Amino acid sequence: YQDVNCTEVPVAIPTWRVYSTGSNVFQTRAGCLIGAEHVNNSYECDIPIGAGICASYQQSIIAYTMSLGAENSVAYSNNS
Amino acid sequence: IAIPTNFTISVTTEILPVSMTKTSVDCTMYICGDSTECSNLLLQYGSFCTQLNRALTGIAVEQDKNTQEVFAQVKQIYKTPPIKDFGGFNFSQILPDPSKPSKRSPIEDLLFNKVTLAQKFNGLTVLPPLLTDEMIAQYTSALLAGTITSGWTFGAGPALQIPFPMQMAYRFNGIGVTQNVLYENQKLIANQFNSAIGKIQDSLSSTPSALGKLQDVVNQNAQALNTLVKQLSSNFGAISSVLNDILSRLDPPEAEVQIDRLITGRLQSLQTYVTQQLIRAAEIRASANLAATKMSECVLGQSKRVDFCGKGYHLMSFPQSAPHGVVFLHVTYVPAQEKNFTTAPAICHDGKAHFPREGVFVSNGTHWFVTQRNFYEPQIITTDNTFVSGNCDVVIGIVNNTVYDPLQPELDSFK
Amino acid sequence: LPPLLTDEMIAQYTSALLAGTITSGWTFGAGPALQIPFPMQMAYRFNGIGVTQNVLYENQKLIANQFNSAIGKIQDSLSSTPSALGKLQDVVNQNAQALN
Amino acid sequence: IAIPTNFTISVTTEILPVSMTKTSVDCTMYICGDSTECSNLLLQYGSFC
Amino acid sequence: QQLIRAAEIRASANLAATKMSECVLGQSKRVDFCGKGYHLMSFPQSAPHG
């Protein structure tokens, strides 16, 4: 649901009742996603959502914060 | 001829917008405004509504690709070493500041504060960008760390570390000035670099209209949105500009005409707005492509194209994020303090002509010397730095002189 | 609306650029303009495409004659053929037709 | 292998437009043309001009 | 129509400025960017609208 402080999805509107006021709710900047489980990990970006959040399919659908890339560091010494 | 004897390092600012504000308009709600009769009447007109929605969505998608092409160009994310010993150089202005909210560098903070910026309307909406400001800052920091520690090697293959003064020596050797010029003047170069970067912040802060380009985009987009909103309250040749009065005060049969007039007017206004947005988006896309090219060709490597990055002989560059664009800090080499000499195309010794391998023949009045072409450094003429070709008759401006053989003294001493 | 820059000032810019590039070489685009004789500038420019300086200093007359001949032929080539300046006239015609 | 033994110096022209002709059209005068009734009627249409 | 034509003319003017800066003000090593062959130099001449 786009840009809604979703405390009122059932009022806002069969099988739709599963995706209306479900067991999983996660408020984001772009709205809130129903039917996906939040994850503390971070992977590459599948189907985007907004504000640096990409949903994906692992089963189940997971919403996570995007990961830019693998961390790296070069051993910099003044004579190497 | 006139050869300079001294140089100056300068830093120049460049600003290029790379993105717009993603937006979408409720096509049916804007024209109708939650009315059943209006929707029923609009159903006759066909599929203009879907066309407008598809065009706006296509415009909104491309901004994310613009940002992705401009910034996301490094496979990995690099990190600056905890200890900073760069041979006398100072990067505290561009590198991220740890003891600070968020992670923006002081120059980025100044840029974000300088730009002056948004509401909810009837059918209009704004979609948040795919990449937040922190991620763009992380991209810029990764690029900056990679170019500080590795050079241009991190844009081709695996990153390979190298001391900074050696990288700068390579970059002078890349414009026809030997390494010893930097290696014998390291402290002065460091001082000039630090002073130029320090002056950049004051130059940005003093003039209020320094940006002038990222603000115009915001102003004109806001003007377009405001005039689109204001177009809603117009008679358009109808009895009234509000549907409720027409519906209530008048019966339907001669009210469909007024409703149709209002629908035609609002549809025309929306179509004009969409067309203008399409043209502006094309312009912004061209600018973003140019910015991506400048990134890839100047930040990730030294450029030989004249006046592409800064005015002068290009050295290297530093990106900085901006609210809806990117800022470049081109570092260039500019000579100064020139004085004239007298030349000659060739030197005639032993009946044969001689030409310089790298440089020119000059003399300060009596004695001839070979020097470079961008820094006056005389050298004694020997066989090592000249090559012979043909006789002296064919060349026009030959002169009378001698060239020494370094082997002769040793050979005479040791038979 | 009249143009901001009259044709005389545009000609003055072009003349300044031309004088700078004949006299000072490419230096006037980097910093202060620096003197250099023209045959040495062409020696630099041959050296810049992988050809040593020998060819020019021993063939100065030939290159000068070919340069003069080519410049002379340019006038005839762009004058005799009527359909040379096509893009400019096309733009003017398009604007005039749309306004009409 | 092949290696040239002689060269020719040649020049070539190239043409690029850089500017259009500046122009402007008055919306009210074009649409109405010295008529107060037309101007009053057009005032309702909004701010297209 | 005028807006679209003006955008095209702006693109052409940008290309002309790039050619001026890259070839009049210095030698260029991009192939076939300035002429057909190994580029040496260039000279600008004005025109009515170009």
Add this chain to the structure above:
Amino acid sequence: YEPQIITTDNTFVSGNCDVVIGIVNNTVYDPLQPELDSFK
């Protein structure tokens, strides 16, 4: 990476030793001394 023995043909002399920082000592072979000694 193809290392080579430092001689006087791949290096050029410039200036004095103390002006530059980071200098290190080594020897630089001269390709003429052997044949010079071969003809005493």
